[PDB]
């Protein structure tokens, strides 16, 4: 079934290969038909969803029984359809990107969780790796902005989830499913037919950009998954290889630095629900930097650290600035600050405390004592001052560490004075 | 983020303020600035290299001072940029060598050698001498300007201090180059104000400007203005006139950078230099510089970062120039401001306020007396508020809205090139035409056909660019509507041509320069081609070689000959080329033969190089320093065909040749036969429109030799022509037509003539092969049938009728297409519908639906069950999709909800929609069901889609069509716009107003039955769609009126079937004229 879906998608070839831009005379005069587009968008999306389903049920199959599934043709067919999915010169369908990276997640996960990883990695050519990782880098170097999700804009920077493919999907309910009534109206329902019932294409389409916020929530989970499989493949190759090669200092450091800098510039005080996960991205890719630094220093070349010398040390300093502890120091004003920025999590925790938790009633004055610590450290982690001390220590034990001359001692004090110290 | 809110000037200055405090060598400052610049670069979606490359010529210019010290700062800068040092060094060495050479003696030139050659110390001397061999002009600029030293000996000191290979003392004096003057004029390093430092280095750059060949090697000091005497300026004036053309052609080469790795800092100092040189130049120089200085700052205007300086250089251009000229280059002003105002900040808003109130302040003769389109555009957008700015000119613009014959100047200014001004022209057309529609008195006098043909052939031209312009032009001619041929025309050789007589060669060449100067030489692109422009107008005035030794306009006055030759010289040309009467530019001695008689490039290329070699061969054999035709060797994509006609008239010179003239004639004619061998090869557009256009161009020079041959017989018979032989040159004339009369592959000649447009002469060269043939012969029938399909192209239905009745008698089902147009269409129609009733044959069924269409049995078309069945129509619409494409229009002009709805939602189920017309009628039908669902914005969406379809896919040009053939387009677009704006109606007052000016449309339609019927039946379809009650009153009266015109044109079955719907709604006048159709036909009694 898996190889059938892979060569099925290489049959349904031209869907993920619509070009970046139309011509100057590529007219939008058209019958404005949507039915064939709906057919093959559902074909492609359900196909990749099925690939994801095959691999999670294959994951559920035990840790002795994979070589029956895996041979070279698995990897070759998926490598073609993966380059087809995370495209470069064509318009990307974000739906299939979710599935395609979740596939690689399941792959690397079972590579970690089997004993005979050697037969699988010996089946694997490193070309498959270094062709996957480039598309992962180009994916992670994109941006997430609510006001132009459902706009059609510049490519390869905005995972934008186009209006003409907006439904749920088989595993997750990725959008609003504006198209579900159109799936119902795909057929005449009183008749036996094979030709589709009509969908004029632009009848679809101002009330709430909460749709944009939840789509941002999906995309933040997506970039979390990208750095998660980066973490997973590093734990696969504890040893060094073609792909454990230092570029996960560069690209992950660029991501960490940008999602800290314009976090501080743009987000703290924007009271969208996505702030906490967007600043959990940096919290997790800090550890992705950290254990790459500590446990994988052997390949970390002298040239590439100088390729990223500014952003790495500056990203560490944006945690080492938080050891000052001159904002919080109490309880009183911090809850005013979480009225300022973290009223949305207040709504969340009041809805959970009022409906959806057994332990959240008749609180015996030890368990809201937990709340008046954890909401406050959470809203501090939003407010970008007062991270956790363990994350501050992990940022400290890279810059201060003498494994590499990041700073000299007469340059480090120039950063210590930028807090005091 | 402070820099993030800054536009160009403040943006650049603050980027400098970013990087210098980055280079303030604090470690925390260093790392934070690198981080912020990289994030700023990625959120601006640029690399840091191209981000900072606007100021990197400014930035490391001072690093060139202390590059012996600031190697660490330069190292941080290059690792910030990510490149190597040499990668930016070789391209930004233009701006460090200035302040590396003339500075202190312990040079960083040794270190730029050390980086310029890194792996080798092979020869640092040749490294030095070749980068200075590339860039040694620039140190002439710095040494004469940046520290003002003049002495040639200290110049040689700064040469040979570091350049020992710089031999022969001083190497070849290339310092009088136009490129050298164009790079020395680049120190108008101004400010927002004028410093005393700005004044003194302005006088310094004036001194280094005036320092040239008069004391080149003869040095005086020229560090002071005092040696600028009152004698040397005139030789300086004409020498600078010789410079300026090469100067801003160098500027044009600079700003049209094919390298594209450079920045706009060169462009900004180009704007500085242009501003400076128009500060300092006389009237003769500043008007010899007129044409593509404008195109240079159009290129400046287009870019996102060199606006404000180009706007103030507009402003000083307005300052330093009067109003007699300058008309031809200021359309760009009103075009750019009226098409792009919505971006502009307060800075650009109040400086363009300064522009406009300057223009209405001192230049009212140009604005409100010479170019009234500028006035009408500026007040036709009063959104910018110019009446609120000044207000006193309200009486003047009220008079100018009255006092313009505005249609011909629409036709003139609409013939421009770039999108902006013509978009503004048709926007003026749009607002002016809806205004004339409201005031009910637009003049359709026996002209508006000029401006509609201008719109038509511009939309013909834009078939591959700016579909939005095509759409807006389409809706403009939808607003112009129909303009029936019945009292109107469609305006579209010039004079008898020869070679001998002097005054006719003068008139000939002045018509030549009139044709080639004002469209084509006011807008070219190649700097060598504008030098060629100057060269050809220079040799034209060498042929009329006056005003170069003693003649001026009335300063000389001494002979009325050039007074006559200047008054017959046109006033537009008098404006544009009077400062070039003393042109001093000289060509080069021409090259080898580059041999000929290749049919391979004639096949595969043609007009690219073979037609060019064709021209160059026959001119280098043609004149050879006898005519202006000698100099045209350096134009060789529009520079051809026209010239291609007039180049090949060189046959007159011989009776006994002794010369390769008949050789090259027979050679090019057998090359044309090698063209004639070609039959489409089973190949795509690279055959079937490229070689087709080759056929068309060589076909064009064919019909020119037709035209010139007959007019070159008429010209020698104007006075008298019975002297016929004219001493053997008439025998040469009939020898030319003897060759051309043997040059008739009449099969293939007429074949390719019929294959291209060429309708009437394709018919004529069928006519001559009906003359010379066996009359009863097998080869006649194909040249009957393509003759009748080209008469379907010709549109003369009765010429078609005469052809189908004159020996076209094959089958009986071929002979019953004549009563089709011989007044008896009913027997023809039911013959075709019993022919095609089995619904399997393509031909009979297509002509069934088409002949059923062509006399308006449209209810029977829509009720015809060739598409209606137990299901809908045929899915995957076959090769007989013209069944659909003739049915959807009848379904439009007689409509309902349900049949239109289910049938166009059947036809949407196609996978592809390859025909243009089915998509046209589809989208007008989907607009109709959208307003059945009552959504007028989506209705206008599909109406504008249909506008896009016709503007991009339907429109043919002028010169080819009496607009009977256009009626199928302009009829539908008139109906579509009439549908459109009262789709965009609000209430009944608006509705009755819309129908009243629709009655004005029914006034201006004339009385052509098929468009009459079509437009008001479309109106009928819409107000029976709309079930509103005044829509029903309008319905009843339009049923009545189409019954009236159907009575007037005497086909009163459709009068009955329309007139019923107002008979049953109690209209006794409709009863009376039902009674009159019955009285008309046969039925006196009832």
Curated annotation (Swiss-Prot), chain A:
Post-translational modification: Phosphorylated by MEC1 in a cell cycle dependent manner and in response to DNA damage.
Keywords, comma-separated and alphabetical: Chromatin regulator, Coiled coil, Cytoplasm, DNA damage, DNA repair, Nucleus, Phosphoprotein
One GO BP: telomere maintenance via telomerase
Example of a GO cellular component annotation carried by this entry: nucleus
Origin: domain of life: Eukaryota
GO MF terms held by the record: damaged DNA binding
Subcellular location: Cytoplasm; Nucleus
Function: Forms a complex with the serine/threonine kinase MEC1 which activates checkpoint signaling upon genotoxic stresses. The MEC1-LCD1 complex is recruited by the single-strand-binding protein complex RPA to DNA lesions in order to initiate the DNA repair by homologous recombination, after the MRX-complex and TEL1 are displaced. Required for the recruitment of MEC1 to DNA lesions, the activation of CHK1 and RAD53 kinases and phosphorylation of RAD9 in response to DNA damage. Required for cell growth and meiotic recombination.
Quaternary organization: Forms a complex with MEC1.
Something else known: Present with 606 molecules/cell in log phase SD medium.
Protein name (Swiss-Prot/TrEMBL): DNA damage checkpoint protein LCD1
Organism for this UniProt entry: Saccharomyces cerevisiae (strain ATCC 204508 / S288c) (Baker's yeast)
UniProtKB/Swiss-Prot annotation, chain B:
Superkingdom, natural source: Eukaryota
Boundaries of every FAT domain copy: 748-1086
Effect noted on mutating residue 1049 to S: In MEC1-100; impairs both the G1/S and intra-S damage checkpoints but not the G2/M damage checkpoint
Family, similarity comment: Belongs to the PI3/PI4-kinase family. ATM subfamily.
Subunit structure, as described in the record: Interacts with LCD1, which is required for localization MEC1 to the RPA complex. Interacts directly with the RPA subunits RFA1 and RFA2.
Function comment: Serine/threonine protein kinase which activates checkpoint signaling upon genotoxic stresses such as ionizing radiation (IR), ultraviolet light (UV), or DNA replication stalling, thereby acting as a DNA damage sensor. Recognizes the substrate consensus sequence [ST]-Q. Recruited in complex with protein LCD1 by the single-strand-binding protein complex RPA to DNA lesions in order to initiate the DNA repair by homologous recombination, after the MRX-complex and TEL1 are displaced. Phosphorylates LCD1 and RPA2, a subunit of RPA, involved in DNA replication, repair and recombination.
Protein name (database record): Serine/threonine-protein kinase MEC1
